[PDB]
Design a protein around this ligand. Sequence first.
Ligand SMILES: Nc1cccc(Cn2c(-c3ccc(Oc4cncnc4)cc3)ccc2-c2ccccc2Cl)n1
Length: 364
Amino acid sequence: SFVEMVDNLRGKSGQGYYVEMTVGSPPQTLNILVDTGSSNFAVGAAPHPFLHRYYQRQLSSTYRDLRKGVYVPYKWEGELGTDLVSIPHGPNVTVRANIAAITESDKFFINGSNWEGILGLAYAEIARPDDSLEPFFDSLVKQTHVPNLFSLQLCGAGEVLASVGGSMIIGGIDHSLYTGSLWYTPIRREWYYEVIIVRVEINGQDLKMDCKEYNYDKSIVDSGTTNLRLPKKVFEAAVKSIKAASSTEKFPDGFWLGEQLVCWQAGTTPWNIFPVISLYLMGEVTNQSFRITILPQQYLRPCYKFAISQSSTGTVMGAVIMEGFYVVFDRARKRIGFAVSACHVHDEFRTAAVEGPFVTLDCG
Ligand SMILES: Nc1cccc(Cn2c(-c3ccc(Oc4cncnc4)cc3)ccc2-c2ccccc2Cl)n1
């Protein structure tokens, strides 16, 4: 019953979405960041100023040491083992999955985020230390009859950082979580959830870039990133066009650089002066595509912060993109489906949209 997985996600704005999980025996409860942008199940397993709980291996009778360390600079560092894992508000199963017990970390955990580890939902290829460390979801599917698919409805928010909600439906698709058609873009390669963007428009205006620029050096769907991150050249074109469209009103370039906040007080926000952004993703059919269209309500995250930023690692469709939609990670069919979310934030003139198909007469 997917009903029981509805709203199994919580988080603070900008600090990611976590699901409750239990690890070990007896079950040690922990909040775990849902991260489609990485592939390790990595959990705090030692005291840290930002941790109010951590995984305690010695407390777990079903813990098994893999006698292998793992080091991840970017840092976090830990020791590998296995243990029984469940998601109380997920499939009614328990699996023995790999766990990176994090023993020391620098700028890994986030103060006040309220999660104690990360669930890397991406593929073995980018797992640490290497691809022999089977990711959680692979273990889950292999050990249970849970379908090789999961879907994410991230709803955002709509003194303290705003609380966000969402659902991670494991093993299938919840038709109540979206309206309209699910449109699928292929997973170009199974490492990150890599996809191809073939075109992008700001208020119907084509940036008119060689589509390779959109996926330079790659495009991924990443719940573990807050912003829509864009390659340098695409970002600059995007910002230019967004500045223009919202020319009435003038903001400090500190705002466009996404470090500064802009404020109206209150309920006065001129949404209508900010353009929609349409990302066209490659269709399942060669020369087809569909667009996902997001509002300023998504890319201006709450007083607001510009949630579009520059990337040196390709396009990252982070939370603020996914928050418009119900996103199906159809691992079984190597594709990602998008549908307008039952929870996406919109006003009485615009709405996030998934629309297709659109056609073309090499974008990777
Ligand atoms: N999608 C991405 C992208 C980059 C890294 C990661 C995971 N990660 C983090 C990390 C920590 C907290 C965090 O919290 C946020 C922040 N902003 C929004 N939402 C949640 C996000 C990421 C540190 C080191 C790694 C890492 C690196 C390599 C391999 C395996 C891992 Cl776990 N996931």
